[PDB]
Amino acid sequence: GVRTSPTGEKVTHTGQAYDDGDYRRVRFSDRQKEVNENFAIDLIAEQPVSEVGSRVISCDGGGGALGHPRVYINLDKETKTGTCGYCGLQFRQPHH
Template sequence: MAAPCAALGRACVRGFVWKGPANNSALGCLSTSSWRRNYTVKVSVTGEKITHTGQVFDEHDYRKVRFVGRQKEVNEQFAINLIEEQPVNESDSRIVSCDGGGGALGHPKVYINLTETQNRLSW
Protein backbone atom coordinates (compact mmCIF):
# COMPACT_ATOMS: atom_id res chain seq x y z
CA MET A 1 0.00 0.00 0.00
CA ALA A 2 1.38 3.39 -0.90
CA ALA A 3 2.30 5.73 1.93
CA PRO A 4 0.37 9.01 2.12
CA CYS A 5 2.24 12.14 1.05
CA ALA A 6 2.31 13.47 4.61
CA ALA A 7 4.25 10.39 5.73
CA LEU A 8 6.81 11.02 2.99
CA GLY A 9 7.35 14.61 4.12
CA ARG A 10 5.62 16.17 1.10
CA ALA A 11 2.57 18.38 1.11
CA CYS A 12 -0.01 17.17 -1.39
CA VAL A 13 -3.38 18.21 -2.66
CA ARG A 14 -5.27 15.78 -4.86
CA GLY A 15 -3.97 16.29 -8.41
CA PHE A 16 -1.08 18.48 -7.25
CA VAL A 17 2.43 17.64 -6.05
CA TRP A 18 4.66 19.78 -3.84
CA LYS A 19 7.68 20.95 -5.83
CA GLY A 20 9.45 22.95 -3.10
CA PRO A 21 10.18 26.69 -2.82
CA ALA A 22 10.46 28.52 -6.12
CA ASN A 23 10.72 32.17 -7.19
CA ASN A 24 11.28 33.28 -3.57
CA SER A 25 7.80 32.13 -2.68
CA ALA A 26 7.21 31.02 0.89
CA LEU A 27 4.74 28.36 -0.13
CA GLY A 28 6.52 27.00 -3.17
CA CYS A 29 5.12 26.07 -6.51
CA LEU A 30 2.22 23.70 -6.96
CA SER A 31 1.87 22.09 -10.35
CA THR A 32 -0.31 19.35 -11.73
CA SER A 33 1.07 15.85 -11.43
CA SER A 34 2.07 13.87 -14.52
CA TRP A 35 -0.58 11.13 -14.24
CA ARG A 36 -4.30 11.28 -14.66
CA ARG A 37 -6.81 8.47 -14.24
CA ASN A 38 -8.80 7.81 -17.37
CA TYR A 39 -12.52 7.54 -16.56
CA THR A 40 -13.72 6.64 -20.05
CA VAL A 41 -14.96 3.31 -21.36
CA LYS A 42 -14.68 2.14 -24.94
CA VAL A 43 -17.97 2.15 -26.81
CA SER A 44 -18.87 -0.04 -29.79
CA VAL A 45 -20.36 1.14 -33.07
CA THR A 46 -23.85 0.36 -31.77
CA GLY A 47 -23.28 2.49 -28.64
CA GLU A 48 -22.81 -0.47 -26.29
CA LYS A 49 -20.06 -0.25 -23.65
CA ILE A 50 -17.17 -2.67 -24.13
CA THR A 51 -15.92 -4.59 -21.08
CA HIS A 52 -12.28 -5.04 -20.06
CA THR A 53 -12.25 -8.40 -21.85
CA GLY A 54 -13.46 -6.81 -25.07
CA GLN A 55 -16.92 -8.36 -24.83
CA VAL A 56 -19.39 -6.68 -27.15
CA PHE A 57 -22.50 -8.22 -28.70
CA ASP A 58 -23.59 -7.93 -32.34
CA GLU A 59 -26.73 -5.96 -33.08
CA HIS A 60 -28.88 -9.10 -33.48
CA ASP A 61 -27.19 -11.30 -30.85
CA TYR A 62 -29.69 -13.29 -28.73
CA ARG A 63 -27.64 -12.62 -25.57
CA LYS A 64 -28.71 -8.96 -25.68
CA VAL A 65 -32.18 -10.01 -24.50
CA ARG A 66 -31.08 -9.59 -20.86
CA PHE A 67 -30.52 -5.86 -21.51
CA VAL A 68 -33.98 -5.17 -23.01
CA GLY A 69 -35.47 -2.09 -21.36
CA ARG A 70 -32.23 -1.18 -19.59
CA GLN A 71 -28.65 -0.31 -20.36
CA LYS A 72 -25.68 -2.66 -19.99
CA GLU A 73 -23.69 -1.72 -16.88
CA VAL A 74 -19.90 -1.94 -17.12
CA ASN A 75 -17.50 -1.37 -14.23
CA GLU A 76 -15.30 1.46 -15.50
CA GLN A 77 -12.49 0.85 -12.99
CA PHE A 78 -10.70 -2.17 -14.43
CA ALA A 79 -8.48 -3.93 -11.89
CA ILE A 80 -5.51 -4.08 -14.27
CA ASN A 81 -5.51 -0.27 -14.53
CA LEU A 82 -5.82 0.22 -10.76
CA ILE A 83 -2.91 -2.15 -10.07
CA GLU A 84 -0.78 -0.37 -12.65
CA GLU A 85 -1.20 2.93 -10.75
CA GLN A 86 0.26 1.57 -7.49
CA PRO A 87 3.95 2.34 -6.92
CA VAL A 88 6.48 -0.48 -6.54
CA ASN A 89 7.61 -1.12 -2.97
CA GLU A 90 11.21 -2.24 -2.45
CA SER A 91 12.34 -4.16 0.61
CA ASP A 92 15.61 -5.42 2.03
CA SER A 93 13.84 -8.26 3.85
CA ARG A 94 12.92 -11.58 2.26
CA ILE A 95 9.55 -11.70 4.06
CA VAL A 96 7.17 -8.74 4.11
CA SER A 97 3.66 -8.36 5.44
CA CYS A 98 0.52 -6.39 4.67
CA ASP A 99 -1.96 -5.60 7.42
CA GLY A 100 -4.76 -4.75 5.00
CA GLY A 101 -5.08 -1.14 6.04
CA GLY A 102 -6.92 -1.95 9.26
CA GLY A 103 -10.54 -1.31 10.08
CA ALA A 104 -13.63 -3.05 8.81
CA LEU A 105 -12.72 -2.53 5.15
CA GLY A 106 -9.25 -4.10 5.45
CA HIS A 107 -8.16 -7.72 5.31
CA PRO A 108 -6.29 -9.98 7.76
CA LYS A 109 -2.52 -9.70 7.96
CA VAL A 110 -0.82 -11.49 5.06
CA TYR A 111 2.85 -12.51 4.84
CA ILE A 112 4.49 -12.50 1.41
CA ASN A 113 7.65 -14.49 0.62
CA LEU A 114 9.75 -12.62 -1.90
CA THR A 115 12.13 -13.98 -4.51
CA GLU A 116 15.61 -12.58 -4.98
CA THR A 117 16.33 -11.22 -8.45
CA GLN A 118 19.54 -9.42 -9.40
CA ASN A 119 20.58 -8.54 -5.83
CA ARG A 120 17.20 -6.97 -5.18
CA LEU A 121 13.99 -8.29 -3.65
CA SER A 122 10.83 -7.63 -5.59
CA TRP A 123 7.18 -8.72 -5.59
Protein backbone atom coordinates in the same frame (compact mmCIF):
# COMPACT_ATOMS: atom_id res chain seq x y z
CA GLY B 1 -10.63 1.61 -18.95
CA VAL B 2 -13.89 1.15 -20.83
CA ARG B 3 -13.61 0.68 -24.60
CA THR B 4 -16.31 0.44 -27.23
CA SER B 5 -17.21 -2.43 -29.57
CA PRO B 6 -17.92 -2.30 -33.33
CA THR B 7 -21.66 -2.04 -32.58
CA GLY B 8 -21.00 0.71 -30.02
CA GLU B 9 -21.78 -1.50 -27.01
CA LYS B 10 -19.59 -0.73 -24.02
CA VAL B 11 -17.22 -3.52 -22.95
CA THR B 12 -17.25 -4.56 -19.29
CA HIS B 13 -14.16 -5.23 -17.20
CA THR B 14 -14.85 -8.95 -17.54
CA GLY B 15 -14.79 -8.39 -21.30
CA GLN B 16 -18.44 -9.15 -22.04
CA ALA B 17 -20.07 -7.61 -25.12
CA TYR B 18 -22.87 -8.93 -27.30
CA ASP B 19 -22.03 -9.82 -30.88
CA ASP B 20 -23.73 -8.11 -33.80
CA GLY B 21 -25.92 -11.13 -34.53
CA ASP B 22 -26.99 -11.54 -30.90
CA TYR B 23 -30.67 -10.77 -30.34
CA ARG B 24 -30.29 -10.17 -26.58
CA ARG B 25 -29.05 -6.64 -27.42
CA VAL B 26 -32.76 -5.81 -27.81
CA ARG B 27 -32.97 -5.64 -24.00
CA PHE B 28 -30.94 -2.40 -24.05
CA SER B 29 -33.24 -0.57 -26.49
CA ASP B 30 -34.83 2.54 -24.92
CA ARG B 31 -32.74 1.68 -21.83
CA GLN B 32 -29.05 1.42 -20.92
CA LYS B 33 -26.42 -1.23 -20.23
CA GLU B 34 -25.01 -0.90 -16.72
CA VAL B 35 -21.19 -0.82 -16.82
CA ASN B 36 -18.86 0.00 -13.94
CA GLU B 37 -16.26 2.52 -15.08
CA ASN B 38 -13.51 1.83 -12.49
CA PHE B 39 -11.49 -1.08 -13.87
CA ALA B 40 -9.65 -2.54 -10.88
CA ILE B 41 -6.84 -4.00 -13.00
CA ASP B 42 -5.72 -0.55 -14.20
CA LEU B 43 -6.15 0.97 -10.73
CA ILE B 44 -3.98 -1.69 -9.08
CA ALA B 45 -1.48 -1.30 -11.92
CA GLU B 46 -1.25 2.41 -11.06
CA GLN B 47 0.11 1.74 -7.56
CA PRO B 48 3.87 2.19 -6.99
CA VAL B 49 6.11 -0.69 -5.95
CA SER B 50 7.26 -0.55 -2.33
CA GLU B 51 10.94 -1.07 -1.53
CA VAL B 52 11.85 -2.76 1.76
CA GLY B 53 15.09 -3.92 3.34
CA SER B 54 14.16 -7.48 4.27
CA ARG B 55 13.87 -10.78 2.44
CA VAL B 56 10.36 -11.35 3.85
CA ILE B 57 7.63 -8.71 4.10
CA SER B 58 4.14 -8.83 5.58
CA CYS B 59 0.88 -7.52 4.10
CA ASP B 60 -2.59 -7.21 5.61
CA GLY B 61 -4.18 -4.78 3.13
CA GLY B 62 -4.13 -1.74 5.41
CA GLY B 63 -6.40 -0.68 8.24
CA GLY B 64 -5.46 -3.62 10.47
CA ALA B 65 -8.55 -5.73 11.19
CA LEU B 66 -10.35 -3.92 8.35
CA GLY B 67 -7.99 -5.41 5.73
CA HIS B 68 -7.41 -8.99 4.63
CA PRO B 69 -5.76 -11.92 6.43
CA ARG B 70 -2.10 -11.17 7.06
CA VAL B 71 0.29 -12.98 4.72
CA TYR B 72 4.06 -13.11 4.32
CA ILE B 73 5.78 -12.56 0.98
CA ASN B 74 9.25 -13.71 -0.04
CA LEU B 75 11.41 -11.27 -2.02
CA ASP B 76 14.40 -13.43 -2.99
CA LYS B 77 13.80 -13.33 -6.75
CA GLU B 78 15.68 -10.24 -7.93
CA THR B 79 14.12 -9.99 -11.41
CA LYS B 80 10.53 -10.08 -10.09
CA THR B 81 8.34 -8.23 -7.59
CA GLY B 82 6.50 -10.02 -4.80
CA THR B 83 2.74 -9.57 -5.13
CA CYS B 84 0.09 -9.88 -2.43
CA GLY B 85 -2.44 -12.60 -3.22
CA TYR B 86 -5.27 -10.56 -1.66
CA CYS B 87 -4.46 -6.88 -2.29
CA GLY B 88 -2.30 -6.83 -5.43
CA LEU B 89 0.27 -4.48 -3.88
CA GLN B 90 3.85 -5.10 -4.96
CA PHE B 91 7.05 -5.20 -2.91
CA ARG B 92 10.72 -5.56 -3.74
CA GLN B 93 14.27 -5.14 -2.43
CA PRO B 94 16.46 -2.20 -3.54
CA HIS B 95 18.50 -3.09 -6.61
CA HIS B 96 21.29 -1.48 -8.64
